[PDB]
Design a protein around this ligand. Sequence first.
Ligand code: ADP
Ligand code: VO4
Ligand code: MG
Length: 436
Amino acid sequence: GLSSEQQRAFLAVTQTPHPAHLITGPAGTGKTTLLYALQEFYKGRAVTLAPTGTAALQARGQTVHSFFRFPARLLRYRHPEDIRPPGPHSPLRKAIEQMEVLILDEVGMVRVDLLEAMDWALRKTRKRLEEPFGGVKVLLLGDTRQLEPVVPGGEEALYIARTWGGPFFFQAHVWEEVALRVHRLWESQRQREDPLFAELLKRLRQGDPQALETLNRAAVRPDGGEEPGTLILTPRRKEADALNLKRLEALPGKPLEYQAQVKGEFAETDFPTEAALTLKKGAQVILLRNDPLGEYFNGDLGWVEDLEAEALAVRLKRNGRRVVIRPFVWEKIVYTYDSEREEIKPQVVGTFRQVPVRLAWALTVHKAQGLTLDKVHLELGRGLFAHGQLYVALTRVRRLQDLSLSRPIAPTELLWRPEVEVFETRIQEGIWQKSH
DNA sequence: TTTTT
Ligand SMILES: Nc1ncnc2c1ncn2[C@@H]1O[C@H](COP(=O)(O)OP(=O)(O)O)[C@@H](O)[C@H]1O
Ligand code: VO4
Ligand SMILES: [Mg+2]
């Protein structure tokens, strides 16, 4: 059963014809758990999406990209080359046409161009350009104090700035057409049996510098990452590799190497996994691509069972089922700027073919947002770089005894986005309306 | 530098 404030948000969302709602609150307040109640109330009529694979599985839906078949690149505003409606007799078109409610968890990580593309895709497929999201009622859930959207730094960043003025979902132009009603949750549920830890996280969210000093004294334990049953989180992918390789070549099985084929321009900075990736039987892994046959998805955690030339078997954590993994192809897209028409054109400059698997004793903080973890050791590596990164790493566990840091954290390490301050200030009035 | 395919 839901809590009291969860039930108020349940009724305030399902008892009103209003088409746009946001349920927001600190990490672990029960937003995705109330999302489960919304899925039972709506079940056939609702589609549930999340921006990342891990969040999508945590919300028991799929990624936004996978549902609308969006390409994994910048979705220019209302651009036909990027937002293509489904076929005349496709299962997607009937899904979009029959759909009545769109639930979107972890909306804080949804970049503005992704949200505007959903708006346009729903309008175009339902043949209602007049109405935002094509008449679909959208239920948004997330926290803007958690991880900001991912914005690579090419002309992709300049376009987003020019078109919307920022990468956040609340900067979409559709909010000039609808008022977003805001429901707020406050009471901790993940940390409900450790109120002092919950109070600490509340103060850390407010930016308290003395809260950070109390955390540095209580939680800095360098060897925390070697205690059993501990998931390690890091800011960067390659820092996770160095940590996973330590636990990997400590396993008894025979190692097998999967060598990627790189074509054209594809820097190893952009590799989703290592070009020389070594696995062992029993290694803990996370899957990086969706199965066309639907047996596994991006974000699936599991353990290697068999290793052969270009095919490995993985036992999944999600359902205890055994799936077979084969190499996928990744495209590397860059954006060039025409001076004459003054437009950006995407272009493929390289490919990367490899088994879609990473070792998963250590993960990036981005792959952890939304998870409730039993034990977390945060390895800071070469520092934090994303707004909301530290706060997400700290709030995955239930009790402070389940958390440890590799080194103390300085106040000057902390990132604050001014657009998030402006947003979270106006939302306490209960409404978000983008003017002009 | 993190994500999506
Ligand atoms: N009303 C509730 N009663 C008991 N446990 C709850 C309740 N709401 C949430 N939880 C638990 O708290 C943990 C984190 O909650 P979650 O739904 O992930 O919150 P959020 O989405 O805000 O992070 C989950 O493991 C869930 O089981
Ligand atoms: O509010 V969270 O589902 O990122 O813990
Ligand atoms: Mg959640």
